[PDB]
Design a protein around this nucleic acid. Structure first.
Ligand SMILES: [K+]
Ligand SMILES: [K+]
Ligand SMILES: [Mg+2]
Ligand SMILES: [Mg+2]
Ligand SMILES: [Mg+2]
Ligand SMILES: [Mg+2]
Ligand SMILES: [Mg+2]
Ligand SMILES: [Mg+2]
Ligand SMILES: [Mg+2]
Ligand code: NA
Ligand code: NA
Lengths: 220, 148, 178, 170, 96
RNA sequence: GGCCAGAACCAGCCCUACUGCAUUAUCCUGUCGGGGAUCAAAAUCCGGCGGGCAACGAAGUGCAAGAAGGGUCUUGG
RNA sequence: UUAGGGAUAUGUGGCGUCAAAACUUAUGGGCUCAUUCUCGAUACGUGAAAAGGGUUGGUGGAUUCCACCGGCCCCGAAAAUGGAUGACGCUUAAGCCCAAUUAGUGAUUGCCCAUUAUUCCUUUGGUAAGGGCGGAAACAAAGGAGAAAGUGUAGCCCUUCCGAUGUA
RNA sequence: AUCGAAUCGCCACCUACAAGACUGGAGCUUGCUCCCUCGAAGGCGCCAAGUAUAUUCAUGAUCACAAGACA
């Protein structure tokens, strides 16, 4: 929430509404550790990254194996004063942020800048929905990373069994988001179809030598 | 074949006269021009790239700052002899748009000859359009994998 | 990939002396990564069989035997390995390969995987191309049925190295970070 | 099932390596990983072993036996016309276009840029026509629905007089 | 670390062959100071006067197998505050 | 100008690009006989016989002795 | 194994992130699932036995089963602050055994890190090794300067080679 | 109003979704055949608002942060 000085200076400058170069990653069906490693290396390279749908990250193995792993991590606590002890975050996006943080030099200013370049969400919040096409990480996708006979866990289910209390909220919000997006996609089908037919007829309207040029490079 | 000789030149073969070049640095970076000759004693190249098409005047440029492409216009009828080193030699100052009539006339003569030579080639209209185009490195482009 | 072991024939003999004027000549098959190893194995065999040390012997010839033309074959590999617990274990295994060096290299990788047996504890007794009807194991015999066909499922088709990307738009091939 | 099985006679495209994007015929199956591949009409495709991770099974299958002779393979491939049918598909044309893009000069890239831009301009023209006829663009449909209301309640006396006065003032 | 040699990752350069193509090219790190100090063409072109500054170097060799390049900067090492920031790799000195 | 920077050349180094000699036979090819398998075949395999260069960039087998583009803010001019 | 500096190349060790290197290499073969002690990735060494039982290998018999022997995994396996393959994590491994170097194409150096190796520059010291040192002839301002017969100095001067760490 | 900056791809067609042991559709013979939108491009953008009869560029003098940036 910008200060009044920031707004006043922007008003004086006459500059437009700015948005930094941000990559949005859809983490659904991504392997937790591999996505974390890729994101951490890109953050150390200066990228600004927002990850969405952290509740649908995957870990190899049955849900009980990974819930027991989390409970083992949870019992680590400074006995003489649990405040200032290890802080155990239950939300899936918090879990991903912690996984990435453990893959960074978190005790330097450079690592801190890298970690503060990452924003994690459960689901896809409205401020992210329309910012542009979201990306995947092919080398960290479940369908190429896990042999499909093996059991795997979805991060949100494990989290909700270890203390995360926002599973149903995120589920209902994601259902509403998908319904709104699918209505907006079924509408505008006529606009996309109009542009397709326009390109098809443009082919018959342009000069012929250009058509041949398109043909030899695979565009016509 | 004498290093001391003005005719000495180690210029790479692709920078042949008439070859169209992409200017990589300086005022006219990204403009495509036409190489006319190399100045004596292994000097810089001279490019016109007719000022009508892209705005590059008769200018000298080091060949380490062009990409000489494999597309060429036969300029054997252009008479690049009057382009000399003295043309760009300048009587400097002392205790301190505008074009000398000689430079303006040389530009006119070379430009007319070059425009006719370009219009005399097959796909010559396409080559004039190509000389009008600006080269830029776009997001996602890998120029190190390209032929030129 | 091509087999890591080559097919060598090492021919050698004890150096002739006053006690042995016309010593016997021995021919020795061996599958080795290079000819130095092949000659080392030959001299090990000469020592432990004929009581002839390398310091008193000759190498008449050391040559690679070329592989035949590549044909999908059945290979009987008669092979032995030593372990401390069980001594020497000899087995006869069957393999699908296209060469004898391919079958032998496969046998070595197989013994390494299922029995933790390394190269220098393994002796190959015989490798031989056999007909299909003499194949004994169903996992090898299934591969010469007339109507053998299968889909390629659960494949990980990685891109060409030049075109590999880190971030890609979800339902396109538009690279974002590369 | 629509998946193309690995079998004797199946046409394949080489995925990666020295022979990337070449076509050959499977002549034998070694085991679960290895097949024998040959294409008599490509000079680099003599009979050789390819790992099954490195091939794309195509939708064509000439009818040959396992470990077939070269003459039988050539005759079957020529009679089946598999190479012709495969060449007439769009993925083959895409491979050819990738090859032409890789070797392209700067002038060829400029020609392609001009052709694409001309196509884009002409598609814009056609779209503008159809948009005028039937609105699907944001501005056109907004104009239509706000035009109904603009003409619904601009017939007012004060509105018409204000419009006349403003036309006069300018 | 040995600060006399910088490592640069260039977009779309993902093999040692591409990095080989870039060997010898001029490399620039652009930043700004606080005050306006002397620049090239300070007298000739006063519109160039800026807090903006650049540090120059050249690609010496590729690094690894995946397109990373080693860069030597003129005279002095590039500042560590440039780690993670933009670097310009130009197309000159050209070989084509 | 004894300062900054860019291109040329030179000398010395350092990376290139370009490969010949020998070898293959437990091999290559044709045809007889067998043996195999399915509706029938061909093939995988084994013995003969007649021929041989598997010669694509043959083979990833032994040794190579091929003089002269790009790097030098890694040297000095 | 070490004068103080650059370049190049290695050693041991590595190449998912931390962390340079396979931006998670191959157009390599197998094996492995593990639930509160965390399976594994522990050379030295720093977490185990007698004994026994999922999977996939071997040997020898009987008509698919009988016995026996390996691999990996599991059980046997209990301690006191919360905690440790270094951490995260990894299971189409980033685990184990084996084997490669851009891959049945057409030959025998993928890559990253040293106070090591090679080479270049400078220093310093030798059981140091060689030259020069009889001013060569001429030459003012509107090519210059130096040239000492010397252990040691701003070392007479030049060239060359080798060594260079260190408590008492 | 300091203030000179580093940043250099836009979009109202990507900016919906799911599956990778089955990907547009059929058929029965179930891995082959037949059809198609033939299964390997998000659309633009890169100097004439569009592919052509054009039209100002200099002297900013041969590299220098692009001397400029509401595409
Ligand atoms: K080095
Ligand atoms: K000395
Ligand atoms: Mg508690
Ligand atoms: Mg790294
Ligand atoms: Mg890997
Ligand atoms: Mg470790
Ligand atoms: Mg010395
Ligand atoms: Mg000392
Ligand atoms: Mg600027
Ligand atoms: Na030591
Ligand atoms: Na493997």
């Amino acid at each position: 929430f910008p200060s009044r000085k920031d707004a006043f200076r922007a008003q004086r400058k006459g500059a437009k509404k700015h948005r930094p170069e941000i990559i949005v990653i859809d983490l659904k069906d991504h392997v937790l550790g591999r996505a974390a490693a890729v994101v951490a290396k890109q953050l150390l390279l200066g990228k600004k990254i927002t990850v969405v749908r952290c509740e649908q990250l995957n870990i190899a193995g049955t849900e009980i194996r990974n819930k027991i792993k989390y409970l083992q991590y949870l019992r680590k606590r400074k006995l003489t004063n649990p405040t200032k002890g290890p802080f155990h975050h239950r939300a899936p996006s918090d879990v991903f942020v912690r996984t990435v943080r453990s893959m960074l030099p978190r005790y330097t200013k450079r690592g801190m800048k890298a970690l503060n370049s990452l924003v994690a969400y459960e689901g896809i919040p409205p401020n992210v929905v329309r910012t542009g096409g979201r990306v995947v990480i092919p080398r960290a996708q479940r369908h190429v990373c896990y042999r499909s006979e093996r059991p795997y866990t979805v991060l949100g289910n494990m989290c909700k069994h270890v203390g995360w209390k926002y599973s149903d909220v995120v589920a209902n919000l994601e259902k509403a988001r998908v319904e709104k997006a699918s209505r907006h996609h079924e509408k505008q089908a006529k606009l996309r179809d109009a542009w397709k037919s326009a390109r098809k007829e443009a082919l018959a309207k342009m000069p012929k030598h250009n058509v041949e040029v398109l043909k030899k490079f695979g565009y016509a | 074949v004498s290093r001391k000789s003005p005719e000495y030149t180690t210029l790479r073969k692709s920078c042949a006269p008439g070859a169209i070049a992409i200017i990589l640095a300086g005022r006219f970076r990204g403009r495509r021009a036409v190489i006319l000759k190399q100045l004596p004693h292994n000097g810089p190249l001279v490019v016109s790239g007719p000022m009508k098409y892209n705005g590059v005047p008769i200018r000298r440029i080091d060949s380490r700052y062009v990409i000489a492409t494999s597309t060429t216009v036969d300029i054997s009828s252009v008479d690049t002899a009057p382009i000399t080193a003295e043309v760009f030699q300048r009587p400097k100052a002392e205790k301190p748009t505008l074009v000398s009539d000689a430079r303006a006339q040389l530009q006119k003569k070379i430009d007319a000859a070059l425009i006719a030579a370009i219009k005399k080639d097959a796909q010559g209209k396409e080559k004039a359009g190509y000389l009008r185009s600006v080269f830029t490195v776009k997001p996602g482009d890998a120029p190190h994998r390209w032929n030129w | 990939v091509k087999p890591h072991l080559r097919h060598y024939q090492v021919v050698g003999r004890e150096s002739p002396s006053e006690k042995n004027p016309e010593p016997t000549v021995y021919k020795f098959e061996v599958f080795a990564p290079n000819f130095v190893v092949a000659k080392s194995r030959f001299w090990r065999m000469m020592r432990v069989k004929n009581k002839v040390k390398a310091t008193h012997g000759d190498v008449l010839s050391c040559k690679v035997v070329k592989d035949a033309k590549l044909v999908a074959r059945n290979y009987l590999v008669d092979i032995a390995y030593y372990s401390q617990r069980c001594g020497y274990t000899r087995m006869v295994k069957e393999f699908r390969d296209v060469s004898k060096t391919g079958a032998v290299s496969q046998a070595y990788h197989d013994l390494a995987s299922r029995h933790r047996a390394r190269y220098h504890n393994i002796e190959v007794l015989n490798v031989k191309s056999i007909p299909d009807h003499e194949v004994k194991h169903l996992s090898i015999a299934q591969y010469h049925a007339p109507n053998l066909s299968f889909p390629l499922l659960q494949r990980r088709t990685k891109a060409t190295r030049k075109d590999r990307a880190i971030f890609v738009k979800k339902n396109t091939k538009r690279a974002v970070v590369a | 099932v629509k998946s193309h099985y690995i079998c004797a006679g199946r046409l394949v495209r080489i995925l990666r390596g020295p022979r990337q994007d070449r076509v050959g015929v499977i002549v034998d199956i070694v085991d679960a990983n290895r097949v024998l591949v040959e294409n008599p009409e490509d000079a680099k495709m003599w009979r050789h072993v390819q790992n099954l991770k490195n091939v794309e099974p195509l939708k064509y299958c000439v009818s040959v036996s396992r470990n077939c002779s070269a003459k039988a393979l050539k005759d079957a491939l020529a009679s089946s016309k598999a190479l012709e049918k495969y060449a007439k598909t769009r993925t083959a044309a895409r491979v050819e276009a990738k090859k032409a893009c890789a070797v392209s000069t700067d002038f060829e890239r400029y020609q392609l840029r001009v052709a694409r831009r001309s196509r884009a301009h002409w598609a814009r023209k056609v779209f503008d026509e159809k948009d005028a006829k039937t609105p699907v663009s944001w501005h056109k449909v907004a104009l239509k629905k706000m035009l109904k209301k603009a003409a619904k309640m601009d017939s007012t006396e004060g509105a018409k007089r204000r419009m006349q006065k403003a036309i006069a003032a300018r | 670390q040995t600060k006399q040699t910088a490592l640069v990752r260039v977009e779309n350069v993902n093999t040692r062959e591409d990095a080989t193509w870039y060997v010898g090219k001029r490399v620039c790190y652009v930043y700004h100071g606080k005050k306006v100090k002397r620049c090239v063409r300070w007298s000739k072109a006063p519109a160039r006067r800026s807090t903006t500054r650049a540090l120059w170097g050249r690609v010496t060799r590729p690094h690894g197998n995946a397109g990373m390049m080693r860069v030597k900067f003129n005279g002095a090492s590039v500042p560590a505050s440039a780690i993670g920031r933009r670097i310009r790799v130009y197309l000159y000195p050209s070989q084509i």
